[PDB]
Amino acid sequence: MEHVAFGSEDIENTLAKMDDGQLDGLAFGAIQLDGDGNILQYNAAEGDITGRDPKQVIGKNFFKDVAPCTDSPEFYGKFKEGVASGNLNTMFEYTFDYQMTPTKVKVHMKKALSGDSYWVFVKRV
Ligand SMILES: *C(=O)/C=C/c1ccc(O)cc1
User: Fold this and answer.
1) Which of the residues 9, 24, 87, 119 has the least number of beta carbons within 10 Å of its own beta carbon?
2) Which positions carry S-(4-hydroxycinnamyl)cysteine?
3) Where are the alpha helices (DSSP H) in 1-125?
4) Can you tell me the distance from the alpha carbon of 117 to that of 37, in angstroms, rounded to the nearest whole number?
């Protein structure tokens, strides 16, 4: 397991340019989205929480396709505001309930260092 904690202050530096294998070593779920919400990376810990197959979701749109319960002001709306400002950094709890047992989580969405890239980190609460 990579020795990185959820919520750490420089998480975007520690995870910068991590390949898929390295991302699979985190204690928490990690998704990388483009500015439209298309899925670029999705780790094993996230697939274990949500049931999704980390290989199959790459290229799908998170808000339109995979996670319609996040297509709301409280998740997608916050994401797109942070994308626009270039300073996305928000941590909030949320419930995931599309075609799954409702699962309450803490979400941390933060701009990635790579261009047109945004992290969504997830752990259970
Ligand atoms: C609501 O539809 C949430 C769905 C969901 C959240 C996070 C994921 O990694 C996958 C699906």
Assistant:
1) 9
2) 69
3) 11-14, 20-23, 44-50, 78-85
4) 9
Resolution in A: 0.9
Cα gap 10→86, rounded to integer Å = 16
Q: Which fold has domain 1-125?
A: Beta-Lactamase (3.30.450)
Which of 19, 60, 5, 36 lies closest to 117, judged by CA?
36
What technique solved it? X-ray
- Give the position of tokens 């991590």: 18
- For ligand 1, the distance from its centroid to the CA atom of residue 3, given in whole angstroms, is 25
What is the spatial order of strands in the sheet that 103-111 belongs to?
Answer: 39-42, 29-33, 118-124, 103-111, 89-96
Find the 87 Cα to ligand 1 centroid distance in Å: 23
Domain positions in the chain are 1-125
Q: Atom 5 of ligand 1 has which residue's CA nearest to it?
A: 67
The tokens of 82 are what?
């942070």
* Any atom of ligand 1 within 6 Å of the Cβ of 70: yes
